[PDB]
């Protein structure tokens, strides 16, 4: 969706944005996996386990 | 010149929305050449059908709320933008929807025209809470291409200006997602050949095979200018 | 400026006795802004013939503004 300039980080020393991006991706990864399991309709038991 | 044409090999329709298309054999480097050039056309140029105009009775503007309805009129409009419709004959059709009672209104409740296919009948449009509540609306579907917003459309036409006609951003383009993967294809002699696997994800209808044919057509049509005129 | 200069251009495009009583009344070329009855002090010395010649100058000038492209165009302002 967006392309941000990395040259606005080392000078700024706001590394929170990077951690937010990594974790945000991880959060969305789990979201994409649950999304994939719901599209397949595996079952209540398997969703519960994951 | 060692001219070598590919042939459409497999069309694996995993779903009506998602389809994989393998393609071989491709001469070395033509996998990415065609792969990308096609992907660009497939995302933009592809034509389709989408809701342009909405008219609900007892609704003057999109910002109001209708009683006996969970969704605000804007919420309902957003749902209609995502309504999958195929029109076979005409380029412009007006579908009518009258529904009542305690029911999640689905796409199936729309009176389907003879040559009009609702691709996702279970698609949610509105939630009627009060049983006495009845909703009646006329959804105008037009055929077009790309993204034509309601802001571009309220600054051009406007000869007839009916108060109580809600204009909607048209999302004509069917291609939701596209990726092409290039794997090596093996001939007895030529092991440098490649296969092009195009994973398409589209909204309702537009057929995977049909889309690819049209996309290659638009590319060849542009190439006419560089072949015919020098 | 454009408005006042515009009229002058088409004021010398009418008759010689049509712009010698129409301007000497409004005080455009003349020294003093006279009325229909006061234009008699110059040379006209008439009351009805002055009013016929004033409006005859105005009517030929209305068609000069309709052809150049004003009339209803310059009506709003």
């Amino acid at each position: 969706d967006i392309v941000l300039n990395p040259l606005g980080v080392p000078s700024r020393m706001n590394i929170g944005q990077i951690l937010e991006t990594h974790l945000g991706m991880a959060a969305k990864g789990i979201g994409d996996k649950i999304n994939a399991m719901l599209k397949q309709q595996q079952e209540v038991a398997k969703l519960r386990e994951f | 010149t060692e001219f070598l044409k590919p042939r459409l090999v497999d069309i694996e329709q995993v779903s009506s929305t998602h389809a994989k298309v393998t393609l071989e054999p491709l001469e070395r480097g033509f996998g990415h050449t065609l792969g990308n050039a096609l992907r660009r056309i497939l995302l933009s140029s592809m034509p389709g059908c989408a809701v342009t105009e909405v008219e609900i009775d007892g609704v003057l503007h999109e910002y109001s709320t209708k009683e006996g309805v969970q969704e605000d009129i804007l919420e309902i409009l957003l749902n209609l933008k995502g309504l999958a419709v195929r029109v076979q004959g005409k380029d412009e059709v007006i579908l009518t929807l009258n529904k009542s009672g305690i029911g999640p209104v689905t796409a199936a409740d729309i009176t389907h025209d003879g040559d009009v296919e609702i691709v996702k009948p279970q698609h949610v449009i509105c939630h009627l809470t009060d049983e006495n509540a009845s909703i009646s609306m006329r959804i105008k579907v037009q055929r077009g291409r790309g993204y034509v917003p309601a802001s571009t459309r309220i600054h051009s036409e406007e000869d007839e200006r009916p108060i109580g006609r809600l204009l909607v951003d048209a999302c004509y383009s069917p291609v939701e997602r596209i990726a092409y993967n290039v794997e090596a294809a093996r001939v007895e002699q030529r092991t440098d050949l490649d296969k092009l696997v195009i994973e398409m994800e589209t909204n309702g209808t537009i057929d995977p095979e049909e889309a690819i044919r049209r996309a290659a057509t638009i590319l060849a049509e542009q190439l006419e200018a560089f072949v015919d005129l020098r | 400026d454009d408005m006042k200069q515009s009229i002058v251009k088409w004021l010398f495009e009418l008759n010689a006795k049509q712009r010698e009583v129409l301007a000497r009344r409004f005080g455009l070329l003349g020294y003093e802004a006279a009325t229909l009855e006061d234009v008699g002090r110059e040379i006209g010395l008439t009351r009805e013939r002055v009013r016929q010649i004033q409006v005859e100058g105005l009517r030929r000038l209305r068609e000069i503004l309709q052809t150049q492209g004003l009339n209803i165009e310059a009506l709003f302002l």
Partner: protein, 352 residues
């Protein structure tokens, strides 16, 4: 009514008409510069990157003012005296103010800088055009060491240029940047790994040898190629890029026992409060230097895993380091609080 024909007229009027752009605050004369305007649909002014330096203009919500020189005299004042192309050098020091920054430097650094062998080490190329062909074709990295043959143009005693063909050992990247380089400049100027400091000397040299027109076109070319390769490079900011010293906790525990020694010498009533203050501050100031030096040796020359023969050492390709070393962004004190230790902070008083 904004009729169709009115846009074509507007297009006619603004051609060859200079407009003044101004940014607050206007500290020196370059805070106002003239440009030829280019009409764009969309409500934001588009500014040339290379003059962002003069304006101190960063697009974090900055706004600018537009002024129309009306009279023929004012138009000529704008085109001759105030045009950006005519006003390159700082009036304060004899130095060019129009100097690539940020992405531009990073791209050119990336191109010029060398790697061990990589794709197509020790190849032989006919022209820099064959080099470009090789790179974009994917049978040579920009950092591949290569014996190419480039023909440089050196100025003689008169105005006539003397050209000379020779085989130098440069990277593919450097050969391609030579194409941007005007005829008249030496090849040895681009043959080094280019940073912001070298690129300004490039522009200065260009100005004193060739003059205004060539420098203006050259500066634009450098900007285009700089951005272009910066984007190709796919450079980014990871959490693994911030390398810390393997010997931080040791240095800190040591410095902490040391400070404890002077606190104990205070409790004994011999060393005054002021002497201890000064000696504690000196211990930590040295600890800070040592940790920073440790990070920077560990980071600068951390690429000690090469090939060809056996184990070889070369400059680290860490994105964060590259950014600092090129002078694109970051510094040695910015990396201190990014992987090493923050250090001592001084109060609103001024006191630490």
């Amino acid at each position: 009514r904004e009729e169709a024909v009115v846009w074509d007229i507007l297009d006619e009027v603004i051609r060859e008409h200079p407009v003044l752009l101004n940014r607050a605050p206007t500290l020196h004369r370059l805070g106002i510069q003239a440009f030829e305007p280019v009409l764009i649909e969309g409500k934001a002014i588009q500014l040339h990157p290379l003059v962002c330096a003069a304006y101190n203009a960063d697009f974090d919500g900055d706004q600018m003012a537009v002024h129309v020189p009306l009279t023929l005299e004012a138009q000529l004042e704008a085109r001759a005296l105030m045009m950006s192309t005519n006003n390159i050098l700082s009036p304060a020091n004899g130095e060019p103010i129009i100097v690539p920054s940020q992405d531009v430097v990073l791209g050119l650094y990336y191109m010029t800088r060398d790697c061990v062998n990589a794709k197509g080490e020790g190849m032989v190329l006919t022209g820099p055009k064959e080099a470009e062909r090789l790179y974009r074709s994917g049978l040579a990295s920009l950092h591949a060491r290569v014996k190419v043959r480039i023909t440089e143009y050196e100025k003689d005693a008169n105005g006539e240029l003397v050209a000379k063909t020779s085989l130098k050992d440069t990277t593919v990247g450097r050969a391609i940047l030579w194409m941007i380089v005007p005829k008249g400049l030496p090849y040895s100027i681009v043959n080094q790994a280019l940073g912001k400091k070298a690129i300004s000397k490039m522009l200065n040299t260009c100005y004193r040898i060739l003059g205004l027109k060539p420098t203006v076109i050259f500066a634009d070319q450098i900007m285009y190629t700089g951005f272009a390769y910066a984007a190709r490079s796919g450079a980014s900011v990871g959490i693994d890029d911030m390398v810390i010293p393997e010997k931080k906790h040791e240095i800190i525990s040591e410095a902490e026992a040391e400070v404890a020694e002077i606190q104990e010498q205070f409790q004994s009533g011999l060393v005054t409060a002021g002497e201890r203050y000064n000696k504690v501050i000196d211990i930590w100031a040295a600890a800070n230097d040592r940790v920073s030096k440790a990070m920077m040796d560990n980071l600068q020359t951390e690429t000690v895993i090469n090939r060809d023969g056996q184990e070889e050492k070369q400059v680290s390709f860490n994105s964060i380091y590259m950014m600092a070393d090129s002078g694109a962004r970051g510094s040695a004190a910015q990396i201190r609080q990014l992987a090493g230790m923050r250090g001592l902070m001084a109060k609103p008083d001024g006191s630490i």
